[PDB]
Amino acid sequence: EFEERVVTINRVAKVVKGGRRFRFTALVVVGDKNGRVGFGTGKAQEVPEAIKKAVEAAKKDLVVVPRVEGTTPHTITGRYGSGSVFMKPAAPGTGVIAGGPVRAVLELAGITDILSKSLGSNTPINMVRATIDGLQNLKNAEDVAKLRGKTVEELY
Template identity: 45%
Template sequence: MMKKNFKKRPPREEKEFDQKLVDLARVTRVTKGGKQMSFRATIVIGDRKGRVGFGIGKSSDVSTAISKAAKEAKKTLLSVPLKNETIPHEVLSKFGAGKVLIKPATKGRGIKVGGAMRVVFELAGVPNVTGKILGSKNKINILYATFEALKQLRK
């Protein structure tokens, strides 16, 4: 016979934000005592309703680096203005050697952007947008440039 006095697990709370790991790198710091390895995690979070953010976290183990990145991402949240299910106007932004060009797209077109920009628009909940990465395709610089472009958007 089965025991009937088992403990019920409390219901799992719904997460406010979805998160995606964009980049995970093992980085090395060279000191007098030798090489010190650590991990750098880059995460994009969003609620698919117009709010999105990203963060970078470093730690000696992967899970701590990811949680640090998620914590930082919540601090950098910004809202994306939408007009007819797309962005209101064309915008060009640059960070380092990474340049991004983001254009509005007609309804039904979908997310036509590549690399790290695609994750940002998916998690922001922008259904139709077109974009192009110009210059360097470094994921972190592209994320910074994309967020600079999103800050330039006005309704």
């Protein structure tokens, strides 16, 4: 139905009067394989259900990724904070070329053919937001003709 992949976990502390106390955070990404992707962040005193605490926080907002037929339409560099990604379309039989986190938002998406490379930073909380920003900045090849007022043939 929907697929839910953990990208990473982290053991996060806080100092109080006695010894410091721990809690686990775990951001997770939820893909739907037709090109609709959300993600969420978990924060609880346990591994195996703070995941679920994030997963229920991920479906509450999604993005509608522009599938061109097995690919992405054009070239984009979505950045957010110091981290950045370099997205680039490719041939229909290529595989996906990505780093660690930025294939967990592409194969969990429905694109399957992108050349890409991370740039700038590499902490996994800033990769994914800039990638989602990059996918929001992408447009279809027909609504550009809609706001343009042209037809599809008139652009080429």
